[PDB]
């Protein structure tokens, strides 16, 4: 499995400094909504200049099909390696995004957000009238059949997803606490293809040391 | 009275800025979408504001975990936009966190919730929500209203029903209006739209300013 670090430090300067501390490590970096809204595409260029990190631009697009297609096209021009969209955008949005990205010589991987990991059962049901597990399988099938590369999901749902789609349908599991439970052992047993780790790395006294340990443990 | 918002959806930034210039001094709102913001960022909002004192609706439809949506709404609110929108499907906690964060501003923008994207047909929508569109819209409108939002982005055909289920003071913004086409001005007036968004009929017209003036004249 691959390690992705969530670049969630409060300022651009801190995130770049962290990126510099993780040079030459075989890892991915995830850039979120707040960061992109504030610094734009120029921040992505600066990161690429620090090192050849594979970049997951995490914006969770959710709009009408043509708009999502235009959005995915716009960020793909930046050379990012992975992007995500809401499966809840529906089958037509998914089809239009993949049809648009097929125009690139090299496109990024495209994963669908199933159920936001922040939801609890009651609040999720109020919106989707489905249990979290039910929705995730439902969404994963729609995403798999319509051409996406995988899903963003809880480490606890990763095996179920693959069983209802394919062992080759990718799973990215965020919020992993490597040595914490959603730990590295749970990610391994549940077949996560990608793990995203945040605070355990960025708030640690020696971020590089933590990444080193995770990779070796992997 | 009903407010007119023009969708700045021309393909390039030069075209969009030129359109804004053509509409200078008209009492209208301008809507900036996802592709435009991803491509040009905050500087584009700054440049639009230099054209005239237009009220701006930054339409990004945020949908992420609560703290991330709070952070996003905060960042765009610092630009001085006048209205933003978020997905009601993000849930009540996300709605509460966004409003708690925005109460920290001396002047926050209006915050509307997207209910059911107008692009959906019944079958594809049901596949995701397991509720008919109208049912979902009412359900989402209640959650939005009870948790502090200013109103909803909705089909002009659901505007009156949304207010009946929340309150007449809960705002409705109805996009895709074809003023003289049906979702036309008459329908928007009868269904009590607080804001209408018009795209192609204005930006693809040979004389966009003349179309805006004709719309404003019929509204008033
Ligand atoms: Cl292990
Ligand atoms: Cl909820």
Curated annotation (Swiss-Prot), chain A:
<keyword id="KW-0665">Pyrimidine biosynthesis</keyword>
<feature type="binding site">
    <location>
        <position position="198"/>
    </location>
    <ligand>
        <name>substrate</name>
    </ligand>
</feature>
<comment type="pathway">
    <text>Pyrimidine metabolism; UMP biosynthesis via de novo pathway; UMP from orotate: step 2/2.</text>
</comment>
<keyword id="KW-0456">Lyase</keyword>
<feature type="binding site">
    <location>
        <position position="117"/>
    </location>
    <ligand>
        <name>substrate</name>
    </ligand>
</feature>
<comment type="function">
    <text>Catalyzes the decarboxylation of orotidine 5'-monophosphate (OMP) to uridine 5'-monophosphate (UMP).</text>
</comment>
<feature type="binding site">
    <location>
        <position position="199"/>
    </location>
    <ligand>
        <name>substrate</name>
    </ligand>
</feature>
<dbReference type="GO" id="GO:0044205">
    <property type="term" value="P:'de novo' UMP biosynthetic process"/>
</dbReference>
<protein>
    <recommendedName>
        <fullName>Orotidine 5'-phosphate decarboxylase</fullName>
        <ecNumber>4.1.1.23</ecNumber>
    </recommendedName>
</protein>
<dbReference type="GO" id="GO:0005829">
    <property type="term" value="C:cytosol"/>
</dbReference>
<comment type="similarity">
    <text>Belongs to the OMP decarboxylase family. Type 1 subfamily.</text>
</comment>
<keyword id="KW-0210">Decarboxylase</keyword>
<dbReference type="GO" id="GO:0004590">
    <property type="term" value="F:orotidine-5'-phosphate decarboxylase activity"/>
</dbReference>
<feature type="binding site">
    <location>
        <position position="8"/>
    </location>
    <ligand>
        <name>substrate</name>
    </ligand>
</feature>
<feature type="binding site">
    <location>
        <position position="30"/>
    </location>
    <ligand>
        <name>substrate</name>
    </ligand>
</feature>
<feature type="binding site">
    <location>
        <begin position="58"/>
        <end position="67"/>
    </location>
    <ligand>
        <name>substrate</name>
    </ligand>
</feature>
<feature type="binding site">
    <location>
        <position position="177"/>
    </location>
    <ligand>
        <name>substrate</name>
    </ligand>
</feature>
<dbReference type="GO" id="GO:0006207">
    <property type="term" value="P:'de novo' pyrimidine nucleobase biosynthetic process"/>
</dbReference>
<feature type="active site" description="Proton donor">
    <location>
        <position position="60"/>
    </location>
</feature>
<comment type="subunit">
    <text>Homodimer.</text>
</comment>
């Amino acid at each position: 499995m691959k390690l992705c670090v969530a670049l969630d430090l409060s300022t651009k300067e801190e995130c770049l400094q962290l990126a510099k501390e993780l040079k030459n490590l075989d890892i991915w970096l995830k850039v979120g909504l707040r960061a992109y809204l504030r610094d734009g595409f120029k921040f992505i260029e600066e990161l690429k200049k620090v090192d050849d990190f594979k970049i997951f631009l995490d914006l969770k697009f959710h709009d009408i099909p043509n708009t999502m297609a235009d959005a995915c096209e716009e960020v793909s021009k930046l050379g990012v390696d992975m992007i995500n969209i809401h499966a809840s955008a529906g089958k037509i949005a998914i089809q239009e995004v993949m049809t648009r990205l097929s125009k690139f010589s090299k496109r990024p991987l495209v994963l669908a957000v199933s159920a936001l990991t922040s939801f609890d059962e009651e609040n999720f049901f109020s919106i989707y009238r489905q249990k979290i597990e039910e929705a995730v399988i439902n969404f994963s099938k729609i995403s798999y059949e319509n051409g996406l590369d995988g899903m963003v999901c809880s480490v606890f749902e990763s095996k179920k997803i693959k069983e209802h789609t394919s062992s080759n349908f990718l799973t990215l599991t965020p919020g992993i606490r490597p040595f914490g439970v959603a730990n590295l052992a749970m990610a391994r047993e549940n077949l996560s293809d990608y793990i995203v780790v945040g605070r355990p790395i960025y708030k640690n006294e020696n971020p590089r040391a933590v990444c080193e340990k995770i990779l070796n443990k992997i």
